């Protein structure tokens, strides 16, 4: 049987910053959702409209895996409705979600003794995101009346700030790798069935 790739979106070698999340489109499978729900590795496996045990018997025509890395205390903002600095500016989920949000601790892979300065997040934006609208715009944000003219002196801060991921931060600032599955129903034959 031609199982899905869940060994290159879950146990990868390096994930992506939350401001530019990684979107992988899964199709044409016989997926195995019960391997995930019974792995005892994930600390958060919340399905938001699908019965997690009834997952293994139901076709869908596309799945989307949205991989990124956040703080442990910021995983709360990957639910429909919650807001913060992640759900507002970095990754917004709609309040009709039909999927499962998965996460686990990753302090062994995404931490350096001096700190991992490679996992950025968007700290400043004009207005909130709308569902699944990533924004790779590394241009200067203006929070003051004076026009900015593209120089980062004062009230012209760089919008992306880097997580400081040391191995001694707390169980709530250590890096948690989030993989969000979102299912689709296009009026076309079903591929991902399992």
């Amino acid at each position, epitope marked *: 049987t031609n199982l899905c790739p869940f060994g290159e979106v879950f146990n990868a070698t390096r994930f992506a910053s939350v401001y530019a999340w990684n979107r992988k489109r899964i199709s044409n499978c016989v997926a195995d959702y019960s391997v995930l729900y019974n792995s005892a590795s994930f600390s958060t496996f919340k399905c938001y409209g699908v019965s997690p045990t009834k997952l293994n018997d139901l076709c869908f025509t596309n799945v989307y895996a949205d991989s990124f890395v956040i703080r442990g205390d910021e995983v709360r903002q990957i639910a429909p409705g919650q807001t913060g600095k992640i759900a507002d500016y970095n990754y917004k989920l709609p309040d009709d979600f039909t999927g499962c949000v998965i996460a686990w601790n990753s302090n062994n892979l995404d931490s350096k003794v001096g700190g991992n300065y490679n996992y950025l997040y968007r700290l400043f934006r004009k207005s909130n995101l709308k569902p699944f609208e990533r924004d790779i715009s590394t241009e200067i944000y203006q929070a*003051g*009346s*004076t026009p900015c003219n593209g120089v980062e002196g004062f009230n012209c*801060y760089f919008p992306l700030q880097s997580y400081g991921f040391q191995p001694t931060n707390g169980v709530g600032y250590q890096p948690y790798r989030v993989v969000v599955l979102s299912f689709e129903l296009l009026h076309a034959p079903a591929t991902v069935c399992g």
Partner: antibody, heavy 119, light 107 residues
Framework: QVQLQQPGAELVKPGASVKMSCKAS????????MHWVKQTPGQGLEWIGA????????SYNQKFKGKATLTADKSSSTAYMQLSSLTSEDSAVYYC?????????????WGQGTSVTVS | DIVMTQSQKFMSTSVGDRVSVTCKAS??????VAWYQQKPGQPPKALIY???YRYSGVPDRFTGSGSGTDFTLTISNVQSEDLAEYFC?????????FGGGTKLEIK
């Protein structure tokens, strides 16, 4: 309803240093930068400087560089200015203003102003 | 730095007339200008931003005009509240420099 409140007047002896407090209510304090201006019948209005309470970036006029320092804090909900190297010339009325850039450009809401007389 | 030097310091018109006060910027400050009104004992009230708009809570006779190097605050049909001291600041670059100011008294 947005209001920026301040004390009335401070009595200070020359050579010392005095601090002024400006606390606002009715908006999110950490997102709107606080400016300070100084008025007197001599030179009209002048721009002391500005403080971004959320981040902490400060900007100062050339004339008042080193002569006054601005600070703030999130939990404090009030901007602070301390006046270094006071002389009898710096007796003036000091206003605290809010920028408000997103909805309105210039200094839109003003404090009541504290009159400092060095003598 | 930049300086917005208002052309005149004293005006004197009677209630029921029009008076315009100008304000010239040395450099090219664009259309980033704001106007303030103030009577003795009170903070400068905000009146106009972007040189042509109106803050929330102001009449329609406080017309703002001009752009580039010169700007004008025209008060048509002067009335019981239009008698104060008026300032014009630019904010096109740090630092912001207020204008000298002008005064209006009944003719």
């Amino acid at each position: 309803q947005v209001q920026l409140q301040q004390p009335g007047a401070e009595l200070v002896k020359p050579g010392a240093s005095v601090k002024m407090s400006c606390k606002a209510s009715g908006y999110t304090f950490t997102s709107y930068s606080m400016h300070w201006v100084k008025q007197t019948p001599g030179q009209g209005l002048e721009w002391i400087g500005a403080i971004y309470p959320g981040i902490g970036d400060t900007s100062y006029n050339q004339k008042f560089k080193g002569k006054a320092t601005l600070t703030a804090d999130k939990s404090s909900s009030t901007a602070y200015m301390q006046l270094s190297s006071l002389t009898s010339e710096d007796s003036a009325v000091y206003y605290c203003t809010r920028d408000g850039y997103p909805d309105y450009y210039a200094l839109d809401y003003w404090g009541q102003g504290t009159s400092v007389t060095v003598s | 730095d930049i300086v917005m030097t208002q052309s005149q310091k004293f005006m004197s018109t009677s209630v029921g007339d029009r008076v315009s006060v100008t304000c010239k910027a040395s450099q090219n400050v664009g259309t980033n200008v704001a106007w303030y009104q103030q009577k003795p004992g009170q903070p400068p009230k905000a009146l106009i931003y972007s040189a042509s708009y109106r803050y929330s809570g102001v009449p329609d006779r406080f017309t703002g005009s001009g752009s580039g190097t010169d700007f004008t605050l025209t008060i048509s049909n002067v009335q019981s509240e239009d008698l104060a001291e008026y300032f014009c600041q630019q904010y096109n670059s740090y630092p912001w420099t207020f204008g000298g100011g002008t005064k209006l008294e009944i003719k």
